[PDB]
Amino acid sequence: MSIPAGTYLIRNVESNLYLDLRGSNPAPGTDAIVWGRTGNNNQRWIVTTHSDGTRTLETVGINSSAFIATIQPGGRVTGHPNNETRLTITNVNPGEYSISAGGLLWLANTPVGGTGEAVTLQAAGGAAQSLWVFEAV
Numbered sequence: 001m002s003i004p005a006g007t008y009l010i011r012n013v014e015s016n017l018y019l020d021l022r023g024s025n026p027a028p029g030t031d032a033i034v035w036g037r038t039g040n041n042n043q044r045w046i047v048t049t050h051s052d053g054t055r056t057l058e059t060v061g062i063n064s065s066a067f068i069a070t071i072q073p074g075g076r077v078t079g080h081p082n083n084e085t086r087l088t089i090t091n092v093n094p095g096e097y098s099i100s101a102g103g104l105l106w107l108a109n110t111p112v113g114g115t116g117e118a119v120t121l122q123a124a125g126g127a128a129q130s131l132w133v134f135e136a137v
């Protein structure tokens with residue numbers, strides 16, 4: 001009930017937008033946003049699996065992972081060259097998954113006013129309001 005290891009493109013099903021790194025900056029504190037499909041190196045994510053059943057995402061080329069400093073109901077998702085975060089990617093529908101970090105689900109946060117917004121954690125409600133599709137590249 002989890003995605004296998006490998007390189008994928010993650011797409012949000014609620015708005016048909018792809019997970020992207022803002023500006024391709026290889027610096028700490030770079031927001032992970034949702035943006036239109038371009039297929040560049042900042043939109044391809046390598047999924048690596050661990051022993052306990054958790055998986056991590058790394059950007060291709062830039063080599064910036066997905067790092068959440070404080071796992072709280074309202075924290076953002078950023079990119080760090082060294083530090084990482086162990087995610088849980090479970091299956092709710094055939095084809096559509098859901099990603100959580102420390103028990104809190106993710107959120108879409110579609111861009112408003114021509115500016116992307118960082119993916120933010122969701123409060124403990126248990127209802128997956130955002131599902132992701134892992135298209136093989």
Ligand SMILES: CC(=O)N[C@@H]1[C@@H](O)[C@@H](O)[C@@H](CO)O[C@@H]1O
Pocket residue numbers: 020021022023024035040042116
């Ligand atoms: C090629 C490239 O880096 N594209 C990025 C895009 O991914 C997105 O981050 C945008 C932010 O508004 O800034 C650039 O256009």
